[PDB]
Amino acid sequence: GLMAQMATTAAGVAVGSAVGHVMGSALTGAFSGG
Amino acid sequence: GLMAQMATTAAGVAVGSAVGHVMGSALTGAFSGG
Amino acid sequence: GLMAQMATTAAGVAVGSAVGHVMGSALTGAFSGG
Amino acid sequence: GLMAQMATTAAGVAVGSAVGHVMGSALTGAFSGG
Amino acid sequence: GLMAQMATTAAGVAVGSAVGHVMGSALTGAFSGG
Amino acid sequence: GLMAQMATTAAGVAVGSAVGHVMGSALTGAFSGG
Amino acid sequence: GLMAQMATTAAGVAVGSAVGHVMGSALTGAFSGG
Amino acid sequence: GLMAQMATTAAGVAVGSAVGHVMGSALTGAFSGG
Amino acid sequence: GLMAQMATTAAGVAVGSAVGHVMGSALTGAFSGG
Amino acid sequence: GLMAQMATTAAGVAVGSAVGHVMGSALTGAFSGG
Amino acid sequence: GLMAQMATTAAGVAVGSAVGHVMGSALTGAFSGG
Amino acid sequence: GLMAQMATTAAGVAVGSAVGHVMGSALTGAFSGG
Amino acid sequence: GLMAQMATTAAGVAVGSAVGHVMGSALTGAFSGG
Amino acid sequence: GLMAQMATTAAGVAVGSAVGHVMGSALTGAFSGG
Amino acid sequence: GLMAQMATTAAGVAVGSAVGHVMGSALTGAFSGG
Amino acid sequence: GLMAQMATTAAGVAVGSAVGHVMGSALTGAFSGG
Amino acid sequence: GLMAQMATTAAGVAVGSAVGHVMGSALTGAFSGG
Amino acid sequence: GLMAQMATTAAGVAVGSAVGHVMGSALTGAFSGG
């Protein structure tokens, strides 16, 4: 099979932009205030 | 089969924009205030 | 079969915009105030 | 006087998030399909 | 005087979230299909 | 006077995040499909 | 007066993140598809 | 099968932009305030 | 007066991150597809 | 099979830009405030 | 007056990171596809 | 199979840009504030 | 007056990192595909 | 199989640019504030 | 007045890093594909 | 199999640029503030 | 007045690193593909 | 098999540039502030 992700961005003026892609992966994260 | 995600963004002026894609993945997260 | 997600955004002026896609994934999250 | 904007975000798992702030500015944008 | 805007967001799992703030500004936008 | 913008972000797992700040500025943008 | 912008980001795992600050500036942009 | 990720970005003026790709990987992260 | 911009970033694992600051400047950009 | 990641960036003026690619790898990170 | 920009970055593992500062400058750029 | 990563960057003016590629590797990192 | 820019970077493992500073300068650039 | 990484960069004016490639390697790093 | 730029970098392992400083200068560049 | 890394850089004016390649190697590093 | 630029770099292992400083100078460059 | 690394650099004016290649080697480094 075909598994694809696409993301096209166009702008006259851009201040903040971000693109993130995740495919077939294991992500684990922990956060502690103190 | 075909599994696809698409996201097109166009703007004259953009201040805050973000695109996120997740496919076939395991994500685990924990948050603690203190 | 075909499983697709699409999202097109166009604007003259954009201040806050975000796009999120989730497909065939396991997401677990925990939040603690203190 | 005091003019302030605040935005706090916390999440166990976040896929798409964006924050935009505009203060005392002139923004002009134009969009054309073709 | 005091002019403030606040926005707090907390979630165990978040897919799409966006925050936008506008204060004392001039925004002009135009859109054309073709 | 005091003019301040703040934005705090915390997450166990983050895929797409973006922060944009505009203060006392002139932004002009134009977009053309073809 | 005091004009300040702040942005703090913390995450266990981050894939896409971006921070943009604009203060007292003139930005002009033009986009053409063809 | 074919597994592909694409991300095209075009802008007249860009201040903050970031692109992140993850495929078939194991990511583990830990955060401690103090 | 005091004009300051701050941006602090901390993460266990970071794939894509970018920080941009603009203060008291003139930016002009043009884009042409062909 | 074919596993490919692509990222094209074009801009008249760019201040902050970053591209990150991860494929078939093990990443482990730890952060301590003090 | 005092005009300062600060940017601190800390991470256990970093793949793509970039920091850009612009102050009191004139930037002009042009892009042509062909 | 074929495993490839590509990243093309073009800009009239670039201040901060960085490209990072990781393939089939083991990365371990530790951070301590004090 | 005082005009200063600071950028501190610390990481256990870093693959791609870049820092750019511009102050009181004139930058002009042109790009042509062919 | 074929495992390749490519990165092409072109700019009229470039202040900060860096390219990093990692393939089939073991990287270990430790950081201590004091 | 005082005009200073600082950039400190520390890492356990660094593959690609670059630092660029521009102050009170005129930079002109031209690029041609063919 | 074929394992190749390529990196081409072209610019009218370049202030800071660096290219790093790692293939099939063991890298270990330690950092101590004091 | 005082105009100073500083750049300190420390790393356990460094593969690619470069530092560039420009102050009060005129730089002109031209590039031609053929 | 074939294991090759290539890096081509061309610029009208270059101030800081460095190229580093590592293949099939063991690198160990230690750093101490005092």
Residue numbers in the entry:
A (entry chain P), B (entry chain R), C (entry chain N), D (entry chain Q), E (entry chain M), F (entry chain O), ...: 43 to 76
Give the exact sentences the study uses for this entry.
Mitochondrial proteins CHCHD10 and CHCHD2 are mutated in rare cases of heritable FTD, ALS and PD and aggregate in tissues affected by these diseases. Here, we demonstrate that the low complexity N-terminal domains of both D10 and D2, as well as the full-length proteins, can form amyloid fibrils in vitro and in vivo. For D10 and D2, the central conserved VAV motif forms a beta-strand that is associated with the protofilament interface in all the structures we have observed, suggesting that it may be a critical element in fibril formation and may be expected to appear in ex vivo structures as well.
Although many mutations associated with neurodegeneration are situated within the ordered cores of D10-NT and D2-NT fibrils, other disease-associated mutations occur outside these regions, including the p.R15L mutation in D10, for which we observed evidence of amyloid formation in patient fibroblasts. The resulting structure was nearly identical to the WT D10-NT polymorph-2 structure, indicating that this mutation likely does not alter D10 fibril structure. Interestingly, however, this mutation appeared to enhance D10-NT aggregation, as assessed via ThT fluorescence, although not nearly to the extent of the S59L mutation. This mutation also leads to signal loss in NMR spectra comparable to that observed for S59L, suggesting that it too promotes intermolecular interactions. In the case of R15L and S59L D10, the introduction of a large hydrophobic residue is likely responsible for enhanced intermolecular interactions preceding aggregation. We show here that the p.R15L D10 mutation, situated far outside the D10-NT fibril core region, adopts the polymorph-2 structure of WT D10-NT, providing further evidence, albeit from a single sample and structure, that this fold is favored when the WT D10-NT sequence is preserved in the fibril core region. Although such patients are quite rare, we were able to obtain skin fibroblasts from patients with the p.R15L disease-associated D10 mutation. Staining of these cells with the amyloid-specific dye Thioflavin S (ThioS) revealed ThioS-positive punctate regions that were co-labeled by an antibody against D10, indicating that these cells contain amyloid aggregates, likely containing D10.
